[PDB]
Amino acid sequence: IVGGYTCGANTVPYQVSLNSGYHFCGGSLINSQWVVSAAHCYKSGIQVRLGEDNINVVEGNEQFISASKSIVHPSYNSNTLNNDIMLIKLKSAASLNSRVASISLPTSCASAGTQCLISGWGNTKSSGTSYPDVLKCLKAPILSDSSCKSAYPGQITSNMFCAGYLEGGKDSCQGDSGGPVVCSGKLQGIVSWGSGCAQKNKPGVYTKVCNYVSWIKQTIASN
Ligand SMILES: NCc1ccc2c(c1)CCO2
Ligand SMILES: [Ca+2]
Numbered sequence: 001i002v003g004g005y006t007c008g009a010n011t012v013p014y015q016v017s018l019n020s021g022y023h024f025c026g027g028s029l030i031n032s033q034w035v036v037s038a039a040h041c042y043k044s045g046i047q048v049r050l051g052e053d054n055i056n057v058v059e060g061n062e063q064f065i066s067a068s069k070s071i072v073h074p075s076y077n078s079n080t081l082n083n084d085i086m087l088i089k090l091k092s093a094a095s096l097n098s099r100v101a102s103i104s105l106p107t108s109c110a111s112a113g114t115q116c117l118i119s120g121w122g123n124t125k126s127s128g129t130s131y132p133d134v135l136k137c138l139k140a141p142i143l144s145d146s147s148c149k150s151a152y153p154g155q156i157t158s159n160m161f162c163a164g165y166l167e168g169g170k171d172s173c174q175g176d177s178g179g180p181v182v183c184s185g186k187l188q189g190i191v192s193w194g195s196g197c198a199q200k201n202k203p204g205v206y207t208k209v210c211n212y213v214s215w216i217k218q219t220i221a222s223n
Contacts, residue, residue: 001118001136002126002198003170009053010061012119012135014103014187015180017049018088019064026120026179028187029102032093034220037178038190038207039076039086046070048090051100054133055121061099065090071219073212082157084192084207087219105217106186109210112144116163116183118204120191122175126168126198131175138172140164142183143203151201159211161189164203172204173197181206 016035018025025041027048035048051061068091073083094100110116118138124130140163143151148162156162163181164171172179172191181189189206196202 001120001122001138001176002124002173004124004136004138007119007135007137009059009134010051010099012117012137013099013101015052015119015135017052017055017121018178019047019049020045023055023121023175025177026191027088028180029094029100030105030187030216031102031220032096033090035088035090036187036190036209036216037086037088038084038192039072040078040081040084040192041178042070042072042086046088048088050094053135056133063094063100065092065094067091069223071223073215080155080157081193083159085190085209085212087216089223103180103182103187104185105213106188106210109208110142110183110188112142114142114183116140116142116181116188118163118172118176118179118181118191120172120176120179122177123173123197126196138170140170148203148205151203152205156205159208160192160205161208162203162205163189166201166203168198168200168202171198
């Protein structure tokens, strides 16, 4: 996250870290057994780390649970990033508490102008490279379809939205991938892509979660 703030420990209780020897992506806990992330975060050998603040220090609220199964969306295209969503099942159910909690799925698509919270352990510099240990946060609005399209000609599908600031300075960044965009207590986006971080006229692009709720529910019901 560039241009964000320190969230505070365990203040974003649905935020997980995906670890394969090191943090490599965010995700969102959506029930005791399942996490939502980006398809471009897929790999084998994932351990889900819940209850994290400092990802380099055991602070006392963590739960570490290995994935039993990954399900990339049927229609994910890794060249266009259309349908950039996957589900990860945990080998055991997480203990839910005030610091480890699921985030609700949307029942309707959010509108441009809605305020959201984006979080993660990604790079905090737009030029340069510095990875934080503790979780960073950013409040950012959803941008209109038209302005998203204008920023990225011929790249924004109906499964994507932009959020952030056209003036730049405040955005998600590499290592935030797969993490949440939460708006009014609902998971509306997944950190997906963009062009650099926090550049003028290049806001973040996010997977539009409301389009995937019935796939998510049916997948959970049979897996
Ligand atoms: N600035 C949005 C954005 C830019 C780059 C990036 C990500 C997000 C996740 C992977 O790398
Ligand atoms: Ca920790």
